Amino acid sequence: SKMNVSYRLYIKTPACLLPLSDYMRAQHDYVSPSSSRVYIKDPAVVYTRS
Amino acid sequence: RFGFRDSPFCTSLPRTIMGNDVRRISYNVFSMMEDIDDVISEGFILYDAY
């Protein structure tokens, strides 16, 4: 590395990478709605009896 | 006069029953009623129809 390599290229550290010691920064929360909910597939009919 | 058992005929529909005027509901209003179970407990007169 010290002898044979001539030129080197540097970029800012990508935010994708995360050290193993910082694993708790990857903990995230997702909310799934209740399973008791029922979703309606039928239209609403409008009527009157005068 | 005719000696009928539980005669369904009256000389004229009562103006008052037990000291209070009988409720009168038109047929169109009665058709759209969703609280009919409470109304029929007291009794009413259906009109505005043939």
A49 in B contact zone (CB under 8 Å): yes
The helix/strand/coil state of A29 is coil
**CB < 8 Å to B28, chain A:** 49-50
Element (H, E) at B31: helix B27-31
**Nearest-angstrom CA–CA distance, B1 and B7:** 10
Which of B32, B34, B36, B48 is the best mutation test for A, with the most CBs of A within 10 A?
A: B32
How far CA A24 is from CA of A13, A17, A18, A21, A31, in Å, comes to: 19, 14, 10, 8, 19
Answer yes or no: are the C-beta atoms of B23 and B40 closer than 8 Å: no
Looking up tokens 């000291």, which residue turns up?
B19
Helix (H, G, I), strand (E, B) or coil at B5: coil
Residue B31: how many other CB atoms lie within 10 Å: 13
Please give the resolution of this entry in Å, rounded to 1 decimal.
2.6
User: Which of B28, B25, B22, B19 is closest to B42 using CA atoms?
Assistant: B22
Burial-class residue A44 by CB neighbours within 10 Å (0-12, 13-18, 19+): exposed
